[model samples]
Target: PNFSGNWKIIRSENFEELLKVLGVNVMLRKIAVAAASKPAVEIKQEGDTFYIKVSTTVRTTEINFKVGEEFEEQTVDGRPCKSLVKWESENKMVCEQKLLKGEGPKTSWTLELTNDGELIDTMTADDVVCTKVFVRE
Candidate 1:
């Protein structure tokens, strides 16, 4: 198990985000948050490859990629659009979720590993915006 521990959200902010990015109906936001069935994420890594799972009230999404590799991330929900993810920088992973063709909701989620669990940096469609700042519990 490459990643195994308890994590917490320290900071989080959204823009034209929510469900629109995943191609899901805006209504999903209500259930995705209010429902108690929040998104459950787990990341497993072997060497340079990583596997991540995101489960929410609507659905569960998964991604498998290696450092410096780019692949399509499938939204577990009812979203039809696919997210193009690219492992950016060493110890820094990044990807922008596509909502529409060129204009849509964009989200950037990243994980930074440390001696103690990991640190997370999540943001929305902003040229220079600080989204979610989180650490392990």
Candidate 2:
């Protein structure tokens, strides 16, 4: 249940719709959906602190945070938000991001490890839910 590893996305469902819900431009959404290589997530944990890095063929972003602490994060699509991550269980963690300006919808996601060893990334914005499955790299 140690969520510290490198995982690569194998497949995703409703991701583009989620992007649209988040107000991502059509052009970027298309490019993101058809990226040359799948995105990879790297996670490192030490006690209550975690460092996570998400990378793709076009860009890489990293964040470090301690459990229950709110931190600033810039979304991949360039939105600035306040983020908080909390442990739901040993095998699951939940994150909520609130936009710092405007009336944008609050977003949340869960990073869970399935019993079959797959990483399940479930994102929610409004009613749109995007699930991306990943495998250890």
Candidate 3:
């Protein structure tokens, strides 16, 4: 339930293929390629406040939000959107993204902390779904 820690990516499924299906541009794809391995993530939470920072070879992204509150997000692929985060269970967090200008695909993500303490991040857009698992650092 307490999902606050530094995490390292351990494995991923269909990550590159999903990015391609999402129509990410060449530059972003290059960065994504550089970043697909060895990503470092940090998560912090206090009451309703949640902060997440992801660092990799090509970029660092930081996001802060309150549960159930809608906020603006500019994704790594340069898509601007509004997003809302919610909790599906004690250890599972869900988020939905709506494109601001109706340009990009609508996406959703689930972040669940397993009983074994691995963090499972699942992302979906259209018919594509990708999951990445992380371990505590």
Candidate 4:
């Protein structure tokens, strides 16, 4: 529940479907899904603020947000969005992002850390859902 740690992806399901829903082009999607490009995530929490960094062979992105505050975000895939993060419980949080300019389905990420110490990240866009599992490093 602390949610502050370095984590590495162990596996993912339907990630390509989610990427397709997000409008990622084929080339980028392939790169994103490549085994060599599996991502590592680092999270830090300070009071009501959270800092998250995601790193991959393709790119590294960092975001900081205060719970319930809406902020502008340029997604890793290059979409400009208005994003909000909120806590659902001690061990769970959700992030929602709406495109700022163009029309697109809102994207949501539900992140939960299990009692067994695995981090689960569920990504949803439209009807597409992707689950990624991570283990602490």
For each candidate in the order shown, give its overall lDDT on alpha carbons: 0.54, 0.84, 0.83, 0.82
Cα lDDT tens digits, model 1, 1-137, are 24544445555555235344545566766555554233456667777777877664656667777766556763323334445545565566666555433444445556665555456655444443545444544
lDDT of 2 at 122: 90
- If scored against the real structure, what TM-score would every candidate get? 0.59, 0.90, 0.90, 0.89
Spell out the clash pairs found in candidate 1. Answer: none
lDDT of 4 by residue, 33-83 (tens): 883346879999787788988877867778888889998877535688888
Residue-wise C-alpha lDDT for candidate 3, range 1-137, written one tens digit per residue: 67799999888887776778888777776678767689889999897798999888867878899999998886435588888999998888899988787676667888999999999999887788889999988
Superposed model 4: Cα runs more than 4 Å off: 35-37
lDDT of 2 by residue, 1-137 (tens): 67788988887899889889878899989998777248878999898798989887887889999989999887535678899999899888899888888657668888888888898989888889889999888
Give residue 103's error in model 2 in angstroms.
2.3
* Global Cα lDDT for candidate 4: 0.82
Order of all candidates by lDDT, from best down to worst? Answer: 2, 3, 4, 1
What is the RMSD of candidate 1? 4.5
The residue pairs that clash in candidate 3, if any, are: none
